[PDB]
Short mmCIF file of all heavy atoms in Angstrom, two decimals:
data_model
loop_
_atom_site.label_atom_id
_atom_site.label_comp_id
_atom_site.label_asym_id
_atom_site.label_seq_id
_atom_site.Cartn_x
_atom_site.Cartn_y
_atom_site.Cartn_z
N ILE Y 137 316.22 201.42 219.35
CA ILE Y 137 316.28 200.22 218.60
C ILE Y 137 315.21 200.18 217.59
O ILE Y 137 314.01 200.42 217.80
CB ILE Y 137 315.95 198.92 219.53
CG1 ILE Y 137 317.05 198.92 220.66
CG2 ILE Y 137 316.13 197.69 218.71
CD1 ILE Y 137 316.89 197.93 221.72
N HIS Y 138 315.53 200.11 216.25
CA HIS Y 138 314.61 200.22 215.10
C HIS Y 138 315.15 199.25 214.02
O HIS Y 138 316.19 198.74 214.18
CB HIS Y 138 314.55 201.72 214.55
CG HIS Y 138 313.39 201.94 213.74
ND1 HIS Y 138 313.38 202.49 212.55
CD2 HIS Y 138 312.06 201.71 214.20
CE1 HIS Y 138 312.04 202.60 212.17
NE2 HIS Y 138 311.27 202.07 213.15
N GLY Y 139 314.36 199.14 212.98
CA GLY Y 139 314.88 198.18 211.94
C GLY Y 139 314.42 198.60 210.55
O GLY Y 139 313.33 199.21 210.42
N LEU Y 140 315.14 198.30 209.61
CA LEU Y 140 314.75 198.33 208.20
C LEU Y 140 313.68 197.39 207.85
O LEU Y 140 313.64 196.25 208.24
CB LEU Y 140 315.85 198.26 207.15
CG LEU Y 140 317.01 199.25 207.29
CD1 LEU Y 140 318.10 198.85 206.30
CD2 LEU Y 140 316.55 200.70 207.04
N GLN Y 141 312.66 197.91 206.93
CA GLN Y 141 311.67 197.04 206.56
C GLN Y 141 312.14 195.74 205.95
O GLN Y 141 311.67 194.64 206.25
CB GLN Y 141 310.69 197.72 205.53
CG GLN Y 141 309.54 197.09 205.07
CD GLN Y 141 308.49 196.98 206.25
OE1 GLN Y 141 308.22 197.96 206.83
NE2 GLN Y 141 307.94 195.78 206.43
N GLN Y 142 313.22 195.89 205.11
CA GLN Y 142 313.85 194.74 204.51
C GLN Y 142 315.24 194.55 205.12
O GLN Y 142 315.90 195.40 205.53
CB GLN Y 142 314.04 195.05 202.99
CG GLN Y 142 312.80 195.32 202.19
CD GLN Y 142 312.32 194.05 201.54
OE1 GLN Y 142 311.77 194.04 200.43
NE2 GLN Y 142 312.29 192.93 202.30
N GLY Y 143 315.53 193.29 205.26
CA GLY Y 143 316.74 192.76 205.80
C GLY Y 143 316.54 192.08 207.22
O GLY Y 143 316.02 192.70 208.09
N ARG Y 144 317.01 190.89 207.24
CA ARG Y 144 316.85 190.09 208.57
C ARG Y 144 318.09 189.43 208.85
O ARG Y 144 319.07 189.08 208.07
CB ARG Y 144 315.74 189.11 208.40
CG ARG Y 144 314.33 189.72 207.94
CD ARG Y 144 313.74 190.37 209.14
NE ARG Y 144 312.47 191.01 208.85
CZ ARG Y 144 312.27 192.28 208.49
NH1 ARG Y 144 313.25 193.04 208.27
NH2 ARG Y 144 310.96 192.75 208.41
N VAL Y 145 318.23 189.06 210.14
CA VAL Y 145 319.33 188.14 210.70
C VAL Y 145 318.56 186.84 211.15
O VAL Y 145 317.45 186.88 211.43
CB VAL Y 145 320.11 188.71 211.85
CG1 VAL Y 145 320.75 190.00 211.27
CG2 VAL Y 145 319.18 189.07 213.00
N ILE Y 146 319.32 185.82 211.36
CA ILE Y 146 318.83 184.47 211.92
C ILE Y 146 319.04 184.57 213.35
O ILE Y 146 320.13 184.77 213.94
CB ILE Y 146 319.53 183.27 211.25
CG1 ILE Y 146 319.26 183.27 209.70
CG2 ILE Y 146 319.13 182.02 212.04
CD1 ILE Y 146 317.75 182.86 209.46
N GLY Y 147 318.04 184.45 214.12
CA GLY Y 147 318.12 184.21 215.56
C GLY Y 147 318.53 182.88 216.02
O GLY Y 147 318.54 181.91 215.24
N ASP Y 148 318.74 182.68 217.33
CA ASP Y 148 319.26 181.39 217.88
C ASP Y 148 318.07 180.36 217.74
O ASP Y 148 318.45 179.19 217.77
CB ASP Y 148 319.63 181.58 219.28
CG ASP Y 148 320.86 182.52 219.46
OD1 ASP Y 148 321.38 183.01 218.47
OD2 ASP Y 148 321.24 182.67 220.66
N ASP Y 149 316.82 180.79 217.49
CA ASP Y 149 315.69 179.83 217.24
C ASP Y 149 315.51 179.55 215.78
O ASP Y 149 314.57 178.85 215.40
CB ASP Y 149 314.48 180.42 217.93
CG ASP Y 149 314.16 181.84 217.35
OD1 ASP Y 149 314.78 182.27 216.32
OD2 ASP Y 149 313.21 182.54 217.76
N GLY Y 150 316.46 180.09 214.92
CA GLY Y 150 316.23 179.83 213.58
C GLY Y 150 315.29 180.70 212.79
O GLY Y 150 315.17 180.63 211.58
N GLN Y 151 314.63 181.63 213.55
CA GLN Y 151 313.69 182.54 212.95
C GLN Y 151 314.28 183.69 212.44
O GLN Y 151 315.40 184.14 212.95
CB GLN Y 151 312.53 182.86 213.85
CG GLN Y 151 311.76 181.61 214.49
CD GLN Y 151 310.87 180.76 213.29
OE1 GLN Y 151 310.57 181.37 212.22
NE2 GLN Y 151 310.49 179.57 213.69
N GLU Y 152 313.78 184.45 211.50
CA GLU Y 152 314.22 185.74 211.02
C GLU Y 152 313.83 186.84 212.02
O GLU Y 152 312.68 186.93 212.41
CB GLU Y 152 313.78 186.10 209.65
CG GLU Y 152 314.37 185.26 208.56
CD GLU Y 152 313.98 185.53 207.22
OE1 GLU Y 152 312.78 186.02 206.93
OE2 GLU Y 152 314.83 185.59 206.30
N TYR Y 153 314.79 187.76 212.29
CA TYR Y 153 314.60 188.85 213.11
C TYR Y 153 315.16 190.11 212.33
O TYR Y 153 316.20 190.07 211.78
CB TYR Y 153 315.21 188.86 214.36
CG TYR Y 153 314.56 187.74 215.38
CD1 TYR Y 153 314.81 186.51 215.23
CD2 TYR Y 153 313.60 188.16 216.18
CE1 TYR Y 153 314.25 185.58 215.92
CE2 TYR Y 153 312.99 187.28 216.96
CZ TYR Y 153 313.15 185.90 216.87
OH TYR Y 153 312.54 184.94 217.62
N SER Y 154 314.50 191.24 212.56
CA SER Y 154 315.19 192.50 212.20
C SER Y 154 316.21 192.78 213.17
O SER Y 154 317.35 193.15 212.81
CB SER Y 154 314.20 193.63 212.22
OG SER Y 154 314.78 194.91 212.01
N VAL Y 155 315.99 192.63 214.45
CA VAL Y 155 316.94 192.93 215.60
C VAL Y 155 316.93 191.73 216.47
O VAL Y 155 315.88 191.36 216.99
CB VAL Y 155 316.80 194.17 216.26
CG1 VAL Y 155 317.74 194.27 217.48
CG2 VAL Y 155 316.92 195.35 215.41
N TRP Y 156 318.19 191.06 216.75
CA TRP Y 156 318.29 190.00 217.71
C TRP Y 156 319.25 190.62 218.66
O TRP Y 156 320.47 190.73 218.25
CB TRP Y 156 318.68 188.75 217.08
CG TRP Y 156 319.09 187.72 218.23
CD1 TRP Y 156 320.21 187.58 218.98
CD2 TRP Y 156 318.15 186.66 218.59
NE1 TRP Y 156 320.09 186.45 219.75
CE2 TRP Y 156 318.76 185.88 219.58
CE3 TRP Y 156 316.90 186.18 218.19
CZ2 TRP Y 156 318.40 184.81 220.15
CZ3 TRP Y 156 316.36 185.04 218.82
CH2 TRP Y 156 317.09 184.29 219.82
N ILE Y 157 318.91 190.64 219.95
CA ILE Y 157 319.88 191.03 221.03
C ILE Y 157 319.81 189.89 221.98
O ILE Y 157 318.74 189.54 222.45
CB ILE Y 157 319.51 192.26 221.72
CG1 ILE Y 157 319.72 193.48 220.78
CG2 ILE Y 157 320.46 192.56 222.89
CD1 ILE Y 157 318.92 194.74 221.20
N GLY Y 158 321.02 189.32 222.30
CA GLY Y 158 320.98 188.05 223.15
C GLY Y 158 320.81 188.26 224.60
O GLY Y 158 320.37 189.32 225.02
N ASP Y 159 321.24 187.22 225.39
CA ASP Y 159 321.09 187.27 226.80
C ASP Y 159 322.22 188.07 227.44
O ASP Y 159 323.31 187.93 226.94
CB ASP Y 159 321.17 185.79 227.35
CG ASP Y 159 320.06 184.92 226.86
OD1 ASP Y 159 319.02 185.37 226.40
OD2 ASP Y 159 320.23 183.62 227.03
N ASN Y 160 322.06 188.70 228.62
CA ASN Y 160 323.14 189.23 229.41
C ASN Y 160 323.83 190.26 228.64
O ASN Y 160 325.12 190.55 228.80
CB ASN Y 160 324.06 188.15 229.91
CG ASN Y 160 323.40 187.10 230.51
OD1 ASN Y 160 322.52 187.18 231.40
ND2 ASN Y 160 323.67 185.88 230.13
N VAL Y 161 323.14 191.07 227.76
CA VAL Y 161 323.68 192.16 226.99
C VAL Y 161 323.46 193.52 227.68
O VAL Y 161 322.42 193.59 228.26
CB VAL Y 161 323.12 192.10 225.57
CG1 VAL Y 161 323.50 193.41 224.73
CG2 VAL Y 161 323.44 190.83 224.85
N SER Y 162 324.40 194.36 227.56
CA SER Y 162 324.12 195.73 227.97
C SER Y 162 324.11 196.67 226.79
O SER Y 162 325.11 196.76 226.13
CB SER Y 162 325.28 196.16 229.01
OG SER Y 162 325.25 195.37 230.06
N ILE Y 163 322.97 197.30 226.49
CA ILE Y 163 322.85 198.33 225.43
C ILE Y 163 322.85 199.61 226.17
O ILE Y 163 321.71 199.93 226.63
CB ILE Y 163 321.68 198.00 224.54
CG1 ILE Y 163 321.58 196.58 223.94
CG2 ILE Y 163 321.54 199.10 223.54
CD1 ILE Y 163 322.71 196.28 223.05
N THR Y 164 323.89 200.28 226.27
CA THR Y 164 324.09 201.37 227.18
C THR Y 164 323.66 202.68 226.48
O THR Y 164 323.25 202.83 225.39
CB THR Y 164 325.48 201.57 227.81
OG1 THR Y 164 326.34 201.98 226.72
CG2 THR Y 164 325.92 200.27 228.41
N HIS Y 165 323.63 203.73 227.30
CA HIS Y 165 322.96 205.10 227.00
C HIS Y 165 323.28 205.54 225.58
O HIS Y 165 324.48 205.56 225.11
CB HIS Y 165 323.54 206.17 227.87
CG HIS Y 165 323.20 206.07 229.32
ND1 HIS Y 165 321.84 206.04 229.78
CD2 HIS Y 165 323.84 205.81 230.41
CE1 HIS Y 165 321.88 205.92 231.10
NE2 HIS Y 165 323.07 205.74 231.48
N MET Y 166 322.28 205.87 224.83
CA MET Y 166 322.32 206.52 223.53
C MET Y 166 322.79 205.57 222.38
O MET Y 166 323.00 205.98 221.29
CB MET Y 166 323.10 207.81 223.57
CG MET Y 166 322.42 208.79 224.47
SD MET Y 166 323.49 210.23 224.92
CE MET Y 166 322.22 211.43 225.36
N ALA Y 167 322.95 204.35 222.65
CA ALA Y 167 323.22 203.39 221.72
C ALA Y 167 322.12 203.36 220.77
O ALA Y 167 320.90 203.54 221.00
CB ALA Y 167 323.58 201.93 222.24
N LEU Y 168 322.50 203.07 219.42
CA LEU Y 168 321.51 202.88 218.29
C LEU Y 168 321.73 201.43 217.75
O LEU Y 168 322.88 201.13 217.21
CB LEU Y 168 321.79 203.88 217.20
CG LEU Y 168 321.00 203.70 215.93
CD1 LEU Y 168 319.42 203.73 216.24
CD2 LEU Y 168 321.37 204.79 214.90
N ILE Y 169 320.73 200.61 217.97
CA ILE Y 169 320.84 199.20 217.37
C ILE Y 169 319.72 199.24 216.27
O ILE Y 169 318.58 199.29 216.50
CB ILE Y 169 320.50 198.13 218.36
CG1 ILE Y 169 321.24 198.31 219.69
CG2 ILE Y 169 320.79 196.78 217.73
CD1 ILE Y 169 322.77 198.39 219.51
N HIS Y 170 320.30 199.17 215.02
CA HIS Y 170 319.46 199.26 213.94
C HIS Y 170 319.43 198.04 213.01
O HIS Y 170 320.46 197.66 212.51
CB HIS Y 170 319.65 200.49 213.01
CG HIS Y 170 318.45 201.00 212.27
ND1 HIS Y 170 317.88 200.40 211.16
CD2 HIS Y 170 317.61 202.05 212.51
CE1 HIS Y 170 316.74 200.86 210.89
NE2 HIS Y 170 316.50 201.89 211.59
N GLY Y 171 318.20 197.37 212.83
CA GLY Y 171 318.13 196.21 212.10
C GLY Y 171 318.48 196.51 210.61
O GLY Y 171 318.14 197.61 210.14
N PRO Y 172 319.00 195.53 209.92
CA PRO Y 172 319.31 194.14 210.49
C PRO Y 172 320.56 194.13 211.34
O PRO Y 172 321.60 194.62 211.04
CB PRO Y 172 319.59 193.31 209.16
CG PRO Y 172 319.72 194.28 208.07
CD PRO Y 172 319.25 195.65 208.48
N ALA Y 173 320.37 193.39 212.45
CA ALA Y 173 321.43 193.44 213.51
C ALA Y 173 321.28 192.34 214.42
O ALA Y 173 320.14 191.93 214.83
CB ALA Y 173 321.46 194.66 214.35
N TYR Y 174 322.44 191.64 214.71
CA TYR Y 174 322.55 190.58 215.72
C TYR Y 174 323.59 190.92 216.68
O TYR Y 174 324.70 191.22 216.26
CB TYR Y 174 322.89 189.21 215.01
CG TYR Y 174 323.05 187.96 215.90
CD1 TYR Y 174 322.04 186.99 215.95
CD2 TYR Y 174 324.16 187.85 216.57
CE1 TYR Y 174 322.13 185.93 216.77
CE2 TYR Y 174 324.22 186.68 217.50
CZ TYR Y 174 323.26 185.85 217.57
OH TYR Y 174 323.34 184.74 218.43
N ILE Y 175 323.20 190.90 217.89
CA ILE Y 175 324.13 191.05 218.96
C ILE Y 175 324.14 189.77 219.93
O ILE Y 175 323.12 189.54 220.48
CB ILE Y 175 323.97 192.41 219.65
CG1 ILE Y 175 324.16 193.42 218.71
CG2 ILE Y 175 324.92 192.47 220.84
CD1 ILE Y 175 323.71 194.82 219.39
N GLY Y 176 325.26 189.21 219.97
CA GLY Y 176 325.36 187.87 220.79
C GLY Y 176 325.37 188.05 222.18
O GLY Y 176 325.54 189.15 222.82
N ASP Y 177 325.24 186.94 222.96
CA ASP Y 177 325.04 186.92 224.42
C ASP Y 177 326.35 187.59 225.04
O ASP Y 177 327.49 187.38 224.58
CB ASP Y 177 325.05 185.55 225.01
CG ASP Y 177 323.75 184.77 224.46
OD1 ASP Y 177 322.73 185.29 224.00
OD2 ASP Y 177 323.83 183.47 224.60
N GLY Y 178 326.10 188.28 226.03
CA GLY Y 178 327.11 188.78 226.89
C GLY Y 178 327.86 190.02 226.43
O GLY Y 178 328.72 190.52 227.11
N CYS Y 179 327.40 190.60 225.31
CA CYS Y 179 328.04 191.80 224.76
C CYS Y 179 327.84 193.07 225.67
O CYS Y 179 326.74 193.18 226.17
CB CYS Y 179 327.62 192.09 223.32
SG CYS Y 179 328.33 191.03 222.08
N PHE Y 180 328.83 193.87 225.66
CA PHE Y 180 328.75 195.20 226.05
C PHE Y 180 328.69 196.17 224.94
O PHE Y 180 329.64 196.07 224.13
CB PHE Y 180 329.84 195.49 227.12
CG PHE Y 180 329.86 196.93 227.67
CD1 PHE Y 180 329.15 197.21 228.79
CD2 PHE Y 180 330.67 197.90 226.98
CE1 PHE Y 180 329.20 198.53 229.24
CE2 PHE Y 180 330.68 199.19 227.49
CZ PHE Y 180 329.91 199.56 228.63
N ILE Y 181 327.81 197.02 224.79
CA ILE Y 181 327.67 198.03 223.80
C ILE Y 181 327.77 199.40 224.52
O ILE Y 181 326.74 199.83 225.07
CB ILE Y 181 326.48 197.89 222.87
CG1 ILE Y 181 326.36 196.48 222.17
CG2 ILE Y 181 326.53 199.06 221.77
CD1 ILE Y 181 327.49 196.06 221.36
N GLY Y 182 328.88 200.09 224.38
CA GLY Y 182 329.18 201.26 225.17
C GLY Y 182 328.39 202.50 224.74
O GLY Y 182 327.74 202.54 223.67
N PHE Y 183 328.61 203.63 225.43
CA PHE Y 183 327.75 204.80 225.21
C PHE Y 183 327.79 205.32 223.87
O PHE Y 183 328.98 205.50 223.39
CB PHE Y 183 328.15 205.89 226.21
CG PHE Y 183 328.12 205.53 227.78
CD1 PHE Y 183 328.93 206.23 228.60
CD2 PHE Y 183 327.20 204.64 228.23
CE1 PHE Y 183 329.01 205.93 229.99
CE2 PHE Y 183 327.21 204.37 229.59
CZ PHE Y 183 328.08 204.95 230.51
N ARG Y 184 326.70 205.60 223.29
CA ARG Y 184 326.74 206.35 222.03
C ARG Y 184 327.19 205.51 220.90
O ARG Y 184 327.68 206.06 219.83
CB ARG Y 184 327.26 207.78 222.16
CG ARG Y 184 326.66 208.78 221.27
CD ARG Y 184 327.42 210.09 221.17
NE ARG Y 184 327.58 210.82 222.52
CZ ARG Y 184 326.75 211.56 222.98
NH1 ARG Y 184 325.50 211.77 222.43
NH2 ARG Y 184 326.92 212.25 224.12
#
């Protein structure tokens, strides 16, 4: 999980984030979550 210096998403609290991953999410083996990125509650992100 990494992020670009520039570029943001809005989190559920209204603040800017490079990466927001919600509640009950599975970020599974070898996934790459690279900001700017928002992943909502309950998502499954499968391998690689």
